[PDB]
PDB file of C-alpha atoms and ligand atoms in Angstrom:
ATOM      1  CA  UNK A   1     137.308 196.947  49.272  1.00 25.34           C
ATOM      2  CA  UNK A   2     140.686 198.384  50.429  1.00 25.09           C
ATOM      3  CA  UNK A   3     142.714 195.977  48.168  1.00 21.54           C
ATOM      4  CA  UNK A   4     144.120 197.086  44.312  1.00 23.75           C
ATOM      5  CA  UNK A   5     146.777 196.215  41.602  1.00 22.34           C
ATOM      6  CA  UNK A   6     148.949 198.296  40.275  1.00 20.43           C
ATOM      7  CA  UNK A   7     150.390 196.175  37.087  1.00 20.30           C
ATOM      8  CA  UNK A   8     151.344 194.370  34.547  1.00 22.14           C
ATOM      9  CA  UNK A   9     154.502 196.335  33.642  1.00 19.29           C
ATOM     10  CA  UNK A  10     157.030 194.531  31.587  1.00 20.16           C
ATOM     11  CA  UNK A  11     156.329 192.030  28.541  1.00 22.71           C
ATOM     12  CA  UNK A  12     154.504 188.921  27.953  1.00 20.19           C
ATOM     13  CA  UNK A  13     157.441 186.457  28.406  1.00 19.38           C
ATOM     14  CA  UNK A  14     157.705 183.928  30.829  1.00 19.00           C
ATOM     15  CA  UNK A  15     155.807 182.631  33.328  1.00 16.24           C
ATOM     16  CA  UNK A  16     153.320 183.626  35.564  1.00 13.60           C
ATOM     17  CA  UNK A  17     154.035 184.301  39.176  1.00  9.35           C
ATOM     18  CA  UNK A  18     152.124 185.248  42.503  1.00  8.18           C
ATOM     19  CA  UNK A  19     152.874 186.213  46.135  1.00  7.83           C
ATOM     20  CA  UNK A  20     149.465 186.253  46.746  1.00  7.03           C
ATOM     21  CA  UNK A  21     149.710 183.082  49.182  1.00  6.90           C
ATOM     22  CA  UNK A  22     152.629 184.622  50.958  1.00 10.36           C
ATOM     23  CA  UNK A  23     151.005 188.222  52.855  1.00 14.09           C
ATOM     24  CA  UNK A  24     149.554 185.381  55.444  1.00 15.97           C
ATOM     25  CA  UNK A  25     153.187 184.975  56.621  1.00 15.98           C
ATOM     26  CA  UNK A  26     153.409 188.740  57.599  1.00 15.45           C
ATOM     27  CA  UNK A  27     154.218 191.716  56.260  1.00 15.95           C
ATOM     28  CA  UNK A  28     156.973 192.472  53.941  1.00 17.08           C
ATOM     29  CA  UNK A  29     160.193 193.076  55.929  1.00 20.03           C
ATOM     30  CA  UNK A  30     162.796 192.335  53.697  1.00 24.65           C
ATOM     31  CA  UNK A  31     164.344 192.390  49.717  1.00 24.70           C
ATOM     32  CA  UNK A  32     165.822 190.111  47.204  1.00 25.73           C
ATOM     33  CA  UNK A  33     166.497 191.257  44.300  1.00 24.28           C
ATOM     34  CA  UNK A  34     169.108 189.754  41.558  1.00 26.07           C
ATOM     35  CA  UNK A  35     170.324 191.980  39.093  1.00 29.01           C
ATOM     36  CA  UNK A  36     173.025 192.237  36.298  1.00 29.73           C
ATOM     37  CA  UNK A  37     174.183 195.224  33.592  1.00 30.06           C
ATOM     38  CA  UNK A  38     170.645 195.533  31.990  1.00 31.54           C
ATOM     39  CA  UNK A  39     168.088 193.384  33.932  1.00 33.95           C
ATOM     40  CA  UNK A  40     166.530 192.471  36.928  1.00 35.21           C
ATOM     41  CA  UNK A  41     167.416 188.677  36.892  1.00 34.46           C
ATOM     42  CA  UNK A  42     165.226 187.427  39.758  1.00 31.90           C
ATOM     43  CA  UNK A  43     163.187 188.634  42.857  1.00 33.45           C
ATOM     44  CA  UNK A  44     162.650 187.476  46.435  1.00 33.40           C
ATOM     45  CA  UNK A  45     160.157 188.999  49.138  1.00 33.50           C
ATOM     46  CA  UNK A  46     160.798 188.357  53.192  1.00 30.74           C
ATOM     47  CA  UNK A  47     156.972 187.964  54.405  1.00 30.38           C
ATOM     48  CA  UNK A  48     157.791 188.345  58.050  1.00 28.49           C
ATOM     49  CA  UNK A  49     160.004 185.708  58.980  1.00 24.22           C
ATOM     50  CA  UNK A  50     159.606 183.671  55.835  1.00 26.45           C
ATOM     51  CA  UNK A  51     160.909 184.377  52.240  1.00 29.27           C
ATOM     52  CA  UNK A  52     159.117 183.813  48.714  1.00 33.28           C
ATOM     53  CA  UNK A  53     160.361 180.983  46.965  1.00 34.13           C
ATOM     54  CA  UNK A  54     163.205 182.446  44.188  1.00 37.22           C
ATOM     55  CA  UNK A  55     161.338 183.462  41.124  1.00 37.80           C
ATOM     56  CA  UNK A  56     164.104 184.414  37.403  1.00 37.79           C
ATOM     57  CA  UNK A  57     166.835 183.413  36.969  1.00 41.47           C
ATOM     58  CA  UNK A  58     171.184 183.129  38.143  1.00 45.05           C
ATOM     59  CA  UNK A  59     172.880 185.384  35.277  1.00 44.62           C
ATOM     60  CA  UNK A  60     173.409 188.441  37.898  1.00 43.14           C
ATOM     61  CA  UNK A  61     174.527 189.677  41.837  1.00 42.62           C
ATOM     62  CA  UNK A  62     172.297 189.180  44.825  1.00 42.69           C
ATOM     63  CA  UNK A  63     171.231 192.515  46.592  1.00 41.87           C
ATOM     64  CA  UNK A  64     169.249 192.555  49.749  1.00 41.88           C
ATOM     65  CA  UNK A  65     167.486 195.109  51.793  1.00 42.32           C
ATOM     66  CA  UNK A  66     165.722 194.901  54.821  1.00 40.83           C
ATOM     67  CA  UNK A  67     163.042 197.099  55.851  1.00 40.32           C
ATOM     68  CA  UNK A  68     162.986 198.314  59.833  1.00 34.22           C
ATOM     69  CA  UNK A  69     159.973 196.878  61.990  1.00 30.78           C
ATOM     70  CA  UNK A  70     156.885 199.037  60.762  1.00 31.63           C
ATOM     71  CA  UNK A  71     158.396 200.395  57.856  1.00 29.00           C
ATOM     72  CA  UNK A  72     155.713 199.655  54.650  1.00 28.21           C
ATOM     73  CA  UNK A  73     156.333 200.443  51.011  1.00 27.48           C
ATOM     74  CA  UNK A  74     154.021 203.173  49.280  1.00 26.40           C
ATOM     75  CA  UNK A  75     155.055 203.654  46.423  1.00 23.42           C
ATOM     76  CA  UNK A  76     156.943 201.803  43.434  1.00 22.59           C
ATOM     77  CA  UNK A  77     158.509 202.840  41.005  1.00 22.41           C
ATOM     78  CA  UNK A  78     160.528 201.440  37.564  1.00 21.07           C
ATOM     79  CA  UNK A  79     161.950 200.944  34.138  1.00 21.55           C
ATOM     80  CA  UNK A  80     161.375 198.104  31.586  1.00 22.97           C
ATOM     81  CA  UNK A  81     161.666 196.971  27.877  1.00 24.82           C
ATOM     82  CA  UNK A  82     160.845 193.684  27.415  1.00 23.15           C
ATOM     83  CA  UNK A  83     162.018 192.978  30.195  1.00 21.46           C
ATOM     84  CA  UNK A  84     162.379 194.482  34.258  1.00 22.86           C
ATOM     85  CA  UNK A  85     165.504 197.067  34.866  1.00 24.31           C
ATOM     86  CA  UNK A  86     164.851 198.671  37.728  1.00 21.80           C
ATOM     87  CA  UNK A  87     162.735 199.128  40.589  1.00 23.83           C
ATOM     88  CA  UNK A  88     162.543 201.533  43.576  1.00 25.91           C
ATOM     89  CA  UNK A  89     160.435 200.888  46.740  1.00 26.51           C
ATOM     90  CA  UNK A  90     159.986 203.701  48.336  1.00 24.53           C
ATOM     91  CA  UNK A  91     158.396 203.666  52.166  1.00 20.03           C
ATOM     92  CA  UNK A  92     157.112 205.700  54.539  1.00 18.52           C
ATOM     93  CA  UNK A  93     160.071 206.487  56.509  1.00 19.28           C
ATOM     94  CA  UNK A  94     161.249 208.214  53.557  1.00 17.34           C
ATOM     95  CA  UNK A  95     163.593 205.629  52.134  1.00 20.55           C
ATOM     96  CA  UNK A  96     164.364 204.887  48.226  1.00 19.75           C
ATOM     97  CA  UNK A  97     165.460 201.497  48.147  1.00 18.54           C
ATOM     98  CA  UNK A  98     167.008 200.919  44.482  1.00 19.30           C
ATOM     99  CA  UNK A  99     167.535 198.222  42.338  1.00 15.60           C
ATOM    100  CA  UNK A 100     169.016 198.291  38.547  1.00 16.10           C
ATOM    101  CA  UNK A 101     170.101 200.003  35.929  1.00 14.64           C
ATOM    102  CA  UNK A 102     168.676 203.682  34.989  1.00 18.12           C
ATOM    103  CA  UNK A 103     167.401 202.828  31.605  1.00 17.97           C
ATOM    104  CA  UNK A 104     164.107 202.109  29.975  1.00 21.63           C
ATOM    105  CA  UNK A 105     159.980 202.552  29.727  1.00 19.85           C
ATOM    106  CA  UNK A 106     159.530 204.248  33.199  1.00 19.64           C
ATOM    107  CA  UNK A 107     156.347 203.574  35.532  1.00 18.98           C
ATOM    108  CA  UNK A 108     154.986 204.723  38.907  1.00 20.50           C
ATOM    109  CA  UNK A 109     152.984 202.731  40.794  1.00 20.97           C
ATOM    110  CA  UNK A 110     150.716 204.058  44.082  1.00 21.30           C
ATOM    111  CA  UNK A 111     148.139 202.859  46.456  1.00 22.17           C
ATOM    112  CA  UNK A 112     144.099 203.660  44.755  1.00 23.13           C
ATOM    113  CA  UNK A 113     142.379 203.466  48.258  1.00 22.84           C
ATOM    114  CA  UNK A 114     143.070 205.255  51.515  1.00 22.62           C
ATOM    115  CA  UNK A 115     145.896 204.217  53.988  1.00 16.99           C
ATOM    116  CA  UNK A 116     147.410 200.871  52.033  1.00 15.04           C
ATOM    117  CA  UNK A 117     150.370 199.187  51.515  1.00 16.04           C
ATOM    118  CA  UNK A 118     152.420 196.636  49.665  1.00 17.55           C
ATOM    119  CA  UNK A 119     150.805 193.351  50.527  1.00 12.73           C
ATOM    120  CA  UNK A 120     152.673 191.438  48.176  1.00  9.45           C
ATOM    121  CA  UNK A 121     154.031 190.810  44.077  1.00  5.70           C
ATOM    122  CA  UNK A 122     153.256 189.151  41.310  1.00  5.64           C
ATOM    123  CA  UNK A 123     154.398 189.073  37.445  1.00  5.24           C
ATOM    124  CA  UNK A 124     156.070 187.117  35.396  1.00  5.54           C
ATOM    125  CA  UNK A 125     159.645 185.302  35.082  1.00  4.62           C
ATOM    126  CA  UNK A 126     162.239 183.032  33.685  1.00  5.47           C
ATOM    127  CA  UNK A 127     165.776 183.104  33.457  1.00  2.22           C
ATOM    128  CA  UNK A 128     164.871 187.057  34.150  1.00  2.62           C
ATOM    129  CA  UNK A 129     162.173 189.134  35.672  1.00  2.00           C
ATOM    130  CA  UNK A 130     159.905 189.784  32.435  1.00  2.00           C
ATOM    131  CA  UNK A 131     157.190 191.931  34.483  1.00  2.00           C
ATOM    132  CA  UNK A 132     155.855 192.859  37.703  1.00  2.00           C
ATOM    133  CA  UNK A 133     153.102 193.557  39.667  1.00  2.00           C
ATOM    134  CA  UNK A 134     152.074 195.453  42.674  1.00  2.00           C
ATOM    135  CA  UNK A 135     149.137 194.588  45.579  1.00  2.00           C
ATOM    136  CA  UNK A 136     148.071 197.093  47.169  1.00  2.00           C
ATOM    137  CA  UNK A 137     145.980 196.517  50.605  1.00  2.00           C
ATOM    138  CA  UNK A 138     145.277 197.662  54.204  1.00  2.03           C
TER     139      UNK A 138
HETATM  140  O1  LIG B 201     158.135 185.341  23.094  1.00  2.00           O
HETATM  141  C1  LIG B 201     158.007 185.214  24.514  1.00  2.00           C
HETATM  142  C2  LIG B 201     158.377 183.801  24.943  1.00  2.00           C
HETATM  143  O2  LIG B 201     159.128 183.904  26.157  1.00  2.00           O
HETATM  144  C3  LIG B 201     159.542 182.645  26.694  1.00  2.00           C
HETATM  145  O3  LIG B 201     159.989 182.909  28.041  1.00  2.00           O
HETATM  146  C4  LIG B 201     161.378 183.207  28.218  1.00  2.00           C
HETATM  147  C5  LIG B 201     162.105 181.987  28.790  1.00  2.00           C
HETATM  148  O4  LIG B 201     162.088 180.916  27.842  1.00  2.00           O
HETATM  149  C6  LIG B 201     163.551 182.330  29.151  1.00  2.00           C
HETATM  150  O5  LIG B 201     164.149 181.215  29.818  1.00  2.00           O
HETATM  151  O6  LIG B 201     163.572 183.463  30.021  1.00  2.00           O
HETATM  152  C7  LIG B 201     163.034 184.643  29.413  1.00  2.00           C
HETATM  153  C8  LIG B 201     163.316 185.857  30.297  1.00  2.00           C
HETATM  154  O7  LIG B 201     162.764 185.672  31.605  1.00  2.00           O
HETATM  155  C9  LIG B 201     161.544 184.431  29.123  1.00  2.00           C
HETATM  156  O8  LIG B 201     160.988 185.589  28.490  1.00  2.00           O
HETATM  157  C10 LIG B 201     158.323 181.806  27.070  1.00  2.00           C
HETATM  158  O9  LIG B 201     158.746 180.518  27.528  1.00  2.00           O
HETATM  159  C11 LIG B 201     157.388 181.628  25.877  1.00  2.00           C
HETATM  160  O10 LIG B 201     156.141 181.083  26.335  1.00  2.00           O
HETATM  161  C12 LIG B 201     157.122 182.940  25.135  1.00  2.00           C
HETATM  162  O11 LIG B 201     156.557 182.618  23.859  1.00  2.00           O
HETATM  163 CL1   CL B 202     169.597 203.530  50.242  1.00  2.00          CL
HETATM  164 CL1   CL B 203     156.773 207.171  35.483  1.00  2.00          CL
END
């Protein structure tokens, strides 16, 4: 078993979310993330050609980054309270791709077995991102 889960950080508000049906569209090539002066408001993930559907909420701006062909995230990293505030993928082609506000209960999230990636999310939301969760796999 190649796959593991890096997670939950955040709170127990809102509801439950999963990607997990989504890594069958492709790999993750692109990111949505919504975001206003203290939170992460909502998320979005690109699985190849096909984005999640819009998990949180509308109180914040839309940023987007998309990841070049073969470029995989390894690492993730964050700050919360009881809710999300930042997040930074980081991939190997060496880029930081950051989202939110420097502030918070910091975590760092890697791969347990050898040679994974980010598969896909999970976590939990409403009208903001309350946690998140990170799947790990080959
Ligand atoms: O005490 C935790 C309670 O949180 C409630 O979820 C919140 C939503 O109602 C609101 O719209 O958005 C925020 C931020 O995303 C959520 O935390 C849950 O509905 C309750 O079940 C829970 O008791
Ligand atoms: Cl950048
Ligand atoms: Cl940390």
């Amino acid at each position: 078993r190649s796959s593991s889960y890096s997670g939950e950080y955040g709170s127990g508000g809102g509801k439950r979310f999963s990607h997990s049906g989504n890594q069958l569209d492709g790999p993750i090539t692109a990111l949505r993330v919504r975001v206003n002066t203290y939170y992460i408001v909502g998320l979005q993930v690109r699985y190849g050609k096909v984005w999640s559907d819009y998990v949180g909420g509308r109180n914040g701006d839309l940023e987007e980054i998309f990841l070049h062909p073969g470029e995989s995230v390894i690492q993730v990293s964050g700050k919360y309270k009881w809710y999300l505030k930042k997040l930074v993928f980081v991939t190997d082609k060496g880029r930081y791709l950051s989202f939110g506000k420097d502030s918070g209960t910091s975590f760092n999230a890697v791969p347990l077995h050898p040679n994974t990636v980010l598969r896909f999310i999970s976590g939990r939301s409403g009208s903001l991102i309350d946690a998140i969760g990170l799947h790990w796999d080959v």
